[PDB]
Amino acid sequence: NPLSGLTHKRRLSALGPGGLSRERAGLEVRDVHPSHYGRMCPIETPEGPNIGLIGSLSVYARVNPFGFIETPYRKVVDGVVSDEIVYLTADEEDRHVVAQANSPIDADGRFVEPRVLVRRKAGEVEYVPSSEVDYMDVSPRQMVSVATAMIPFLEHDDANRALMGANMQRQAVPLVRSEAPLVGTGMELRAAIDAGDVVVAEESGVIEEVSADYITVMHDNGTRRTYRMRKFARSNHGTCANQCPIVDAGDRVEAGQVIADGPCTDDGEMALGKNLLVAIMPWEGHNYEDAIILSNRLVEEDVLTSIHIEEHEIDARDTKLGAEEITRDIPNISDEVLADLDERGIVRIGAEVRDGDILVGKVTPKGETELTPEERLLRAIFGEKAREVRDTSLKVPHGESGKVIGIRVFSREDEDELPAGVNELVRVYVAQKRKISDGDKLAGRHGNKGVIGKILPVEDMPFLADGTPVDIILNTHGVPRRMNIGQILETHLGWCAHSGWKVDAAKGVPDWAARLPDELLEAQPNAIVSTPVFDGAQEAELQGLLSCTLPNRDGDVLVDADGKAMLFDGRSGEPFPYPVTVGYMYIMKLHHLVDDKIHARSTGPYSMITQQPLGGKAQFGGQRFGEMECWAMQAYGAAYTLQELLTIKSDDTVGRVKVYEAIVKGENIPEPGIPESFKVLLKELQSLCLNVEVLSS
């Protein structure tokens, strides 16, 4: 998504050529240093065996001409805060007694209180010398990166959950629609703009003509410019890169204005997921241990759905026997599976293909070989010829499906640059519209991840007294101990933003709303709001806005001041005995879809030097049965299953076809032999001039 690309930039990796390696890197470089404040994010960081070695540059950080990282600070002079922004590197910061951003200012430029919080040279945050502090933070969120600056209520999340939310915002797949969050931050718009995946007008002008493929704009002085959208393009990771205009045919647009939103953008601001009506109760053990149960509305209305484009490449080359041809004359294969293939081979555009279908019909020469007597007799009986050319056609790999967007054909005969010794290279793009299904991974912005355990029908879904079913149900057992209460805060605020509010300022402003910014005292229903990272909606303000939640359609407040709604059971029909925390949570669909995770094998390719079939879903891979698993089997006392696994399932090349025959013919599975890897080991040892011999007795 645009955020993933933006954060791949602004990434500082402490490893590479001439840098620390994960193994040689100690444990003191991975930690957070006081000098990181404002120069490198302490939160955003990989959670695997790379924590600390890779970080993200903070929002305001800048790079010194010498390579050091500078950070801005407001020069405060004689206790008087100023606007002069000096960019200090870590060294200069240590020599200055730098204050903190949220230090109240008397509006005269001077601190309205003694005892202003400060940092000092040794990185120690401690008591403060009032007055005569030389510098002050430019603004809050100076220490967070762009990804971490998009987590509302970050200050209410533990560093672990904030880290996971930051690392998981970058995994959200681009949905078909994309909705700007009800609760967001100020970083959404800037992140989308600067990511570069959203079209921005270069110069002011009036939109002359807008269509779904390009926008022609007439500038203020004669000249006109045409921006061409990138429709249904494939990204490096297989997602969709669709761009659609967001401007009419007469609008005047100024320079730098967004005029066509990108993959994960809504009206120019980043949109990684969808706002879903959420209940925070435990429900029948289906949302057990960070599992999620979704309404079927989310599959019917198609709100969590992603277009995935997969490219398959095949190149006809020059071989000893001759050259490979791409045509619809594949040997021995019928006229049914040669149906969609065009007159020239490669399949047609828009032809639905399921796993195993033929995409590109290729035929490589075989060279004379020795047909068995049985096959020669059969060919004579059925009157055929060897054809002397084998098939190496490209086929939809196992488990895949989809339409066929477009074919890109490069050819030497048409003088297109191709590697040496290849005549043609054809790429077919196959697009599938994935719908959310159990096994797919979802998450909010607060590290509240989880796979989908079940997708309930809308009718057996808890519904508010109004009758609106809830879309998602998270578990209450995951909030208190993971220390990411921020999500709950978000939920409440989301609901308020969805409903709209009116603070009753009949007799002045309520004491809890005195410091609220003007014009927030009244918000129309479905009003997008922002809570910046470390200055946001305080809990008292949230309580107040939750109290005044102007009614949905009749006079009926579905959520009391406590934030909990009385839900009706979808199946039983009785109301649940106690209210349930209901709101609107902005949840993303992570790119860990079960369709790419499922894999199975009964027999397939075997490795070259050893058997023990190839590993990997990309091949037809067997699941590694390591030493820990073998110890577990030994502890169970199950000797026969372990021998079976390590001999005939994996390595023994004679008992393998024998077990296949026994299974297919109903006979007993045969006795296992010597694994091939042991004889490989014996030969390796002997070739080391070590006389190893297996004495009979």
Partner: peptide
């Protein structure tokens, strides 16, 4: 700041001196 943007109202109580770079 950006010419045409959604009007996302903020709960922010602190003005920012420096625009994001």
């Amino acid at each position: 700041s950006v010419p045409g943007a959604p009007n996302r109202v903020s709960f922010a109580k602190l003005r920012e001196p420096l625009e994001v770079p």
